């Protein structure tokens, strides 16, 4: 029924080497995007994650999949943004994933036309002040 949108590239303002952003769109729920393990800085958060499609595309909802074992980096408070040209970004919604260990779905009020999505991760679960991590990020159209 629903169509999954292909993520072709992305960026992360913080990553641990070997755990860069593309590990969250490789289709494998065991591989992780993971922010830098050096999480002691006062300005460590927020962490900004950008997911890019090939072209502007119709999108109706997204699903964030946290790591399915371990508690380091489960998203908590975020701002979700998107962009129609990959450069200029528009606030979509504030979403609090609550540090949940299960998938978090966000359904948009209306279909949006996006080439890119961006997550401003303000907080995340884990040791110390927390981390940001993601097993898979998915985007769908109805
Ligand atoms: C024993 C020790 O050094 N404890 C310190 C504590 O370490 C936090 C650390 O604990 C576990 O890791 C151990 C060091 C060891 N490698 C192990 O496997 O037991 C956690 N691993 C597991 C499987 O539970 C570590 O989780 C990892 O953390 C990474 C980020 O650092 C990343 O998120 C990985 O994905 C994740 O598996 C981690 O929790 O740290 C405290 C304070 O920070 C210190 O006081 C202890 O001495
Ligand atoms: Ca993955």
Automatic annotation (TrEMBL):
F5/8 type C domain sequence ranges: 1-142
Binding-site list for beta-D-galactose: 34, 67, 72
Binding site for Ca(2+): 23, 26, 28, 31, 135-136
Record protein name field: Carbohydrate-binding protein
Organism whose genome encodes this protein: Bacteroides thetaiotaomicron (strain ATCC 29148 / DSM 2079 / JCM 5827 / CCUG 10774 / NCTC 10582 / VPI-5482 / E50)
């Amino acid at each position: 029924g629903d169509i999954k949108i292909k993520i072709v590239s992305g960026t992360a303002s913080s990553f641990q080497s070997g755990s860069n952003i593309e590990k969250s769109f490789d289709g494998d729920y065991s591989t992780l995007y993971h922010s830098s393990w050096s999480n002691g800085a006062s300005n460590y958060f927020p962490i900004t994650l950008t997911y890019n499609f090939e072209t502007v595309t119709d999108v109706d909802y997204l699903i964030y999949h946290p790591r399915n074992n371990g508690n380091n980096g489960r998203f908590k408070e975020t701002e979700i943004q998107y962009s129609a040209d990959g450069h200029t970004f528009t606030k979509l919604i504030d979403k609090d994933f609550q540090g949940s260990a299960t998938a978090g779905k966000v359904t948009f009020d209306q279909t949006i036309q996006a080439k890119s999505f961006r997550f401003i991760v303000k907080s995340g679960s884990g040791d110390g002040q927390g981390f940001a991590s993601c097993a898979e990020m998915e985007f769908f159209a109805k």
